[PDB]
Design a protein around this ligand. Structure first.
Ligand SMILES: *[C@@H]1O[C@H](CO)[C@@H](O[C@@H]2O[C@H](CO)[C@@H](O)[C@H](O)[C@H]2NC(C)=O)[C@H](O)[C@H]1NC(C)=O
Ligand SMILES: *[C@@H]1O[C@H](CO)[C@@H](O[C@@H]2O[C@H](CO)[C@@H](O)[C@H](O)[C@H]2NC(C)=O)[C@H](O)[C@H]1NC(C)=O
Ligand SMILES: *[C@@H]1O[C@H](CO)[C@@H](O)[C@H](O)[C@H]1NC(C)=O
Ligand SMILES: *[C@@H]1O[C@H](CO)[C@@H](O)[C@H](O)[C@H]1NC(C)=O
Ligand SMILES: *[C@@H]1O[C@H](CO)[C@@H](O)[C@H](O)[C@H]1NC(C)=O
Ligand SMILES: *[C@@H]1O[C@H](CO)[C@@H](O)[C@H](O)[C@H]1NC(C)=O
Ligand SMILES: *[C@@H]1O[C@H](CO)[C@@H](O)[C@H](O)[C@H]1NC(C)=O
Ligand SMILES: *[C@@H]1O[C@H](CO)[C@@H](O)[C@H](O)[C@H]1NC(C)=O
Ligand SMILES: *[C@@H]1O[C@H](CO)[C@@H](O)[C@H](O)[C@H]1NC(C)=O
Ligand SMILES: *[C@@H]1O[C@H](CO)[C@@H](O)[C@H](O)[C@H]1NC(C)=O
Ligand SMILES: [Ca+2]
Ligand SMILES: [Ca+2]
Ligand SMILES: [Ca+2]
Ligand SMILES: [Ca+2]
Ligand SMILES: [Cu+2]
Ligand SMILES: [Cu+2]
Lengths: 735, 735
């Protein structure tokens, strides 16, 4: 019956400047790859080995900050357009990966190729083979080596006898990182076997069969199996284990029931009854009058309710944000996820040697978002791209942008014959990175007042461990017949380059404490009360900062000189949400210097172009001398009136239980922090939105009045649209 | 063009049992009131004074637990229907309020009236006048007394001279609680004046003029002003202050600019430009196939996706939940907010003496919800009632129930040529209590797997303080010309009577720690790793529990006897969210024994019917001997295999800044906790929902398949309905 709601089309805009942080165009990558091929003897990755040279990566080397700001704020020149490339060189006496700068682009006679190392605290462009990237070539070699050893007549018999299925029915693989010893030069690695499945559930059927091997050097004929480990006993050869197994006293631990694996299946059971009313569609968010954010498609610049920002995408980390402005002023120069680790504790030599660096695998080289489900149907989707091993990957549905209506209002008050309520619509930018078993859901949520919330939720299949009743209990709960929910930490680092009221800032904390005082108006009477005291964080602190006990503090990044009208420094408060935790372990043999940012909740440093990133894709196996040692940034420099960067961590101490099988859920695996204005303005700045109501009641007449500021709530008809399911296809990008 | 979405009607059901916790029917109240009138000499409140007898309150006295459970679970008899009443008796030599039980009901010859005290730990049914409730009669007496003193010729002159406006233009009022001294019997109180406004913004214009009076006893002619306090100086009489003001050296502090108060106005400034695209309506939640939760209107019993529960309403606290079940098993007998405090720290004698008990004022006797804004347009609304001072109040739109679509999925995984994603619809029960200046938004959010989240958000006008540059800085920021953002704690207590796998439970924690160990598979090699250790909380601990540093623990309520299939006790995890904070102050002269639950994050006690509630509406002024001293519950009783209650706190340390003017916002003033299954089942239990997708792709054919389990996402038309605005009228209930 009702008239149709008033439709409006999506709005596109022109960015104020070009996106100087954007990924390389296909043509730029091609020119660089061509130049690499004409400069060096380059072999195609599919034909390469440890003695070839081949190209791994080619991506944008982002501009330095000062040149970026000059361009953005002072009509300066476009910064130089350069590529970072990573090439493996095996032609020489020793193999190594080298980072090289190729630029400027487009390729011309001005273009040079030079060693690139300025952002590496270790000062090196070359990463030695022994601590090299676990790339396609090294992975294939390790796989071939494991097969060579595990598929002999003897080992086939040992594996089947212990595990209960033949070798064809399991998959053997290695722990990460590898373990290189700089003192002796040896490189060893542990591994395990899991039952093969058709539903990606291998991590739920680990067999408890382990091994250790020596993979030192580029000649694989010299690699050797060192140990087989089973039921906490060590065997130095296949033969020794085989013989042990023939003895009457040999103990074989309970085997996995591979005929009953329904408990690992995620999707719906066709025999399961529907809950009452679940035969009705769940609620849907709709936009009655169309989309309320705008964008420039060519420059990936976004605008929504006085916020602006550009996005950028990398293979290592996924999305990044640059030049985030609110009401025309920059609040954050760069906001960028840097690293995510997963560090296991266990009784067994596979999980106890697991300390993943997810950027080493790649966070930005995964799968598309599923419309309607991973993001609401009203989302818009964006394509990004990467380059790896000879192929340029186009990734559609890479990230999404949507306006939510939060289910609580932004503010309200009822009094004095009126009610004033302001709605809480938010802009949301999401991407989801499924890295093997885990699914990481990243969200950036912007609010009308100038507040931004950064969050992550995790789900997917856990990396469980075999349950041995004699030894597994201190490290996990028994969650299935022979399965432990191995204990681990997830920790993520974010580079938060706040520039509050300019680049020159101070960091301070309001410390809250109870104190005994006497007041002039009650002489002699002691009162126990509470006070605040502002403390300036004067210099970089090696210990970092941990959130105060009982929440007794507020952490601010202040403008050094700008104040509001009441004399307060303009500031933003870094407010922790859930997941304000850091690593429990302090001294890991699997990460001695490779992830040193993960030991406190947050760190504050002086901004430097050479301190670009807190980890690298090349860090994980370089245990003692990684390209970036985060601790090198902490060298007691003044932060008092300086360009400051906050490196903020979110984390989870995950101890999986029944509520993680078959999968972990996103609702209770959540971490977040907010950046909220604190004396940044003279008042709270959502007041100008039209998405609010002002209700008044007239005491004489007994007449109500409703002011909706141009929003007509009358019933109207709308089409609830089918999501773009057709745009989703399985896979990690189009090559 | 698209066909219309398939509509369905709201579903109503019959509760399995009657709501034995429900508020008294009007007829029940009438019968009790009539019986009180025939038993005692009762005066009508509008004609009463300190020497009259009059009725304050009449409400349901809820059943004891064992009798309730016999009725619910074993087809036992309905528990006795009883009223708790509170009557002021002034006819004697000393005045007191007395609690009286009237029952059973309906009124018959079986009905008696008896002193009621079993839930008061002090063992008394009588509250002495000096520590009495701040009721209509006492408020009136205090108001008259203040006018009699502040409106003399001399004080009119003093007030106008110091404040800059005449007496008619300000309002003077008293700090809460009052200050009764048991040793001498004296009762005193502080107070201040605020500028009158037309928009209920008095709290933003405190004058810095203070006073102190003695209000001991029932003869107001003996009450007397003790002090006037201004600029931190004390005057013992109006004359003394008047004389000082005439001297040349008298310092008058800066006055409020009463002609420029636009900064206190909440609603939109009509001259503000609209932000880009804010002339489009913000997004709306819609239900394409109708509502998916059901209820019994007569019994206030609710059903959604295998959850069931009953609600109850009280003047003191608002909503409570009883008999919360999931998949046919009770997990929580009673979930009830118990108290909310707001405790201020200040340099001044008004704010420093402010320690509000919100249940003393009433959390459940406030205003209706505003449709569409306070709750989404798809919400259903419920009417509740209370009785106070001769009047039965019917409160429509008292609470709302709605299904949200959260903007992130419940779980997902992509791998092995499939993607499986489960949506996250939640049931939400909300009420909002606006108590003078503050607006408290309470939300109860139920998830598909059996998790429940309890949260609060706060907004409204802060109780600010006059800014004296000489003394105010340790207690607040200067947020307007003569205004301080007075530091305060908000703390809320919730009674969480979990009964996990029966009433007989244990409480435990998994403690997480780093440890150095050696493993059998690598003799002599030390590893720094991490472990969990389960510790049973054997006995009640006076210190309560504070959440562990760096989050290194999981707190569980376990069934004492029931386990899942893998030997683990069935449990629920009490998971803190934001706002896991308790009072900073330890020893307040304004709450010595009245709020003893607020000093730690959580307490575990043995369930007792006599330990019904952790505070009472009668606690606030009874500083040393309140009806309930929570510490009485903590007497070292075993909890090892007992009915346990968790008293869980949520809080905020609020240091208002610019982002709180003109009002605090709900987005960043948030606290929550969750109750989540932990080995409660053998697996995660959302898997039977139909609100999920299973996408598969075949690598041979390149064909995709989408399984939506009966949910048709094809575009369809619906009407976006106008909220029931017509049901909203201003006011605190219909009398
Ligand atoms: C961005 O800044 C970095 C750090 O200042 C520059 O790094 C220098 O690079 C040159 C050659 O490229 C080296 O000789 C210097 O030793 C580097 N300095 C440091 C501190 O390591 C880098 O060149 C800058 N990038 C651009 C595009 O100008
Ligand atoms: C609910 O249980 C309480 C606690 O057992 C009962 O309180 C007893 O009440 C009687 C008289 O009412 C007193 O003699 C006892 O001393 C009380 N016991 C305690 C421990 O205080 C209360 O009566 C019960 N309520 C109902 C409706 O039966
Ligand atoms: C280029 O490298 C390949 C791979 O090792 C090698 O076979 C070949 O000898 C090299 N060719 C030249 C020009 O040296
Ligand atoms: C393993 O050995 C078996 C039997 O000897 C053989 O059939 C199979 O091809 C081998 N597998 C691999 C991957 O080499
Ligand atoms: C479906 O449910 C039935 C009944 O419990 C069970 O036997 C079977 O294992 C389930 N199948 C799957 C794939 O979960
Ligand atoms: C990548 O996808 C985008 C948008 O889906 C498209 O416009 C662009 O042409 C694609 N690039 C290539 C090289 O196919
Ligand atoms: C009834 O109470 C009123 C008010 O206190 C009082 O005036 C009157 O004396 C009372 N009647 C009796 C019999 O005490
Ligand atoms: C205060 O006194 C003034 C003048 O003496 C009078 O006009 C006014 O009504 C009084 N206010 C009250 C509340 O009695
Ligand atoms: C409305 O905006 C104008 C222009 O900035 C300002 O002068 C005035 O104070 C505002 N009024 C209110 C009620 O906020
Ligand atoms: C209270 O309000 C409800 C719903 O509006 C109504 O059904 C009921 O009759 C009212 N009760 C009284 C006593 O008016
Ligand atoms: Ca900065
Ligand atoms: Ca430094
Ligand atoms: Ca219990
Ligand atoms: Ca006890
Ligand atoms: Cu995990
Ligand atoms: Cu507050």
């Amino acid at each position: 019956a009702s008239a149709e709601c008033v439709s409006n089309e999506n709005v596109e805009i022109e960015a104020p400047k070009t996106n100087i942080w954007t990924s390389l165009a296909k043509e730029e990558v091609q020119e660089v790859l061509d130049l690499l091929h004409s400069t060096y003897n380059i072999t195609e990755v599919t034909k390469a080995d440890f003695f070839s040279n081949y190209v791994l990566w080619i991506e944008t080397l982002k501009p330095n900050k000062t040149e970026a700001l000059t361009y953005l704020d002072e009509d300066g020149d476009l910064p130089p357009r350069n590529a970072r490339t990573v090439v493996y060189f095996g032609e020489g006496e020793e193999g190594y990966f080298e980072e090289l700068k190729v630029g400027p682009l487009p390729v011309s006679d001005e273009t040079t190729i030079e060693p690139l190392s300025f952002y590496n605290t270790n000062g090196k462009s070359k990463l030695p083979f022994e601590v090299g990237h676990l790339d396609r070539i090294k992975s294939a070699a390790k796989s071939s080596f494991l097969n060579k050893n595990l598929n002999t007549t003897i080992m086939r018999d040992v594996l089947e006898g212990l595990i209960g299925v033949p070798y064809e029915d399991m998959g053997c693989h290695s722990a990460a990182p590898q373990l290189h010893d700089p003192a002796t030069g040896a490189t060893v690695d542990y591994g395990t076997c899991n039952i093969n499945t058709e539903n990606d559930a291998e991590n739920l059927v680990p067999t408890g069969f382990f091994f250790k091997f020596d993979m030192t050097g580029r000649d694989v004929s010299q690699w050797k199996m060192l140990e087989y480990i089973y039921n906490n006993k060590v065997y130095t050869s296949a033969e020794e284990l085989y013989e042990a197994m023939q003895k009457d006293d040999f103990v074989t631990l309970p085997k996995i029931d591979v005929d009953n694996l329904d408990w690992t299946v995620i999707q719906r059971n066709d025999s399961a009854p529907i809950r009452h009313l679940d035969d009705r569609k769940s609620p849907r968010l709709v936009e009655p009058e169309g989309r309320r954010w705008a964008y420039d498609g060519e420059e990936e610049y976004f605008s929504w309710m006085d916020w602006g920002f550009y996005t950028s995408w990398s293979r290592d980390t996924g999305i990044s944000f640059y030049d985030i402005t609110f009401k025309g002023e920059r609040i954050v120069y760069e906001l960028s996820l840097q690293e995510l680790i997963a560090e296991y504790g266990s009784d067994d030599p596979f999980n106890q040697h697991t300390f993943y660096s997810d950027i080493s695998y790649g966070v930005g080289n995964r799968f598309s978002l599923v419309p309607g489900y991973d993001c609401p149907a009203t989302a818009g989707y964006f394509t990004t791209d990467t380059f790896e091993y000879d192929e340029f990957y186009n990734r559609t549905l890479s990230y999404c942008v949507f306006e939510n209506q939060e289910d609580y209002s932004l503010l309200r008050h009822t009094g004095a014959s009126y009610s004033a309520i302001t709605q809480n619509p938010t802009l949301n930018v999401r991407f989801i990175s499924t890295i093997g078993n885990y699914d990481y859901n990243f969200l950036y949520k912007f609010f009308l007042d100038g507040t931004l919330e950064v969050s992550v939720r995790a789900a997917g299949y856990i990396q469980a461990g075999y349950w041995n009743p004699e030894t597994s209990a201190p490290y996990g709960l028994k969650i299935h017949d022979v399965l432990s929910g191995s204990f681990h930490d997830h920790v993520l680092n974010y580079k938060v380059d706040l520039d509050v009221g300019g680049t020159k800032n101070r960091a301070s904390k309001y410390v809250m404490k109870d104190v005994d005082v006497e007041y002039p108006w009650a002489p002699g009477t002691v009162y126990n009360t509470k006070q605040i005291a502002r403390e300036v964080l004067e210099k970089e602190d090696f210990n970092g900062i941990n959130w105060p006990e009982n929440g007794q503090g507020i952490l601010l990044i202040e403008s050094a000189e700008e104040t509001n009208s009441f004399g307060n420094p303009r500031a933003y408060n870094i407010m922790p949400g859930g997941g304000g935790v850091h690593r429990i372990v302090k001294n890991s043999r699997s990460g001695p210097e490779t992830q040193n940012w993960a030991r406190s909740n947050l760190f504050l440093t002086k901004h430097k172009d050479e301190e670009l990133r807190s980890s690298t894709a090349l860090n994980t196996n370089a245990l003692y001398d990684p390209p970036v040692n985060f601790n090198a940034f902490l060298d007691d420099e003044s932060l008092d009136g300086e360009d400051i960067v906050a490196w903020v961590n979110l984390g989870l101490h995950h101890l999986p239980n029944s509520n993680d099988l078959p999968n972990t859920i996103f609702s209770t695996a959540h971490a977040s922090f907010m950046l909220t204005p604190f004396n940044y303005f003279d008042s709270e700045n959502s007041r100008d939105t039209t998405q609010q109501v002002f209700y008044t009641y007239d005491d004489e007449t007994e007449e109500s009045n409703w002011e909706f500021y141009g929003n007509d709530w009358s019933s109207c008809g709308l089409e609830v649209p089918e999501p773009n399911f057709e745009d989703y296809t399985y896979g990690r990008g189009t090559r």
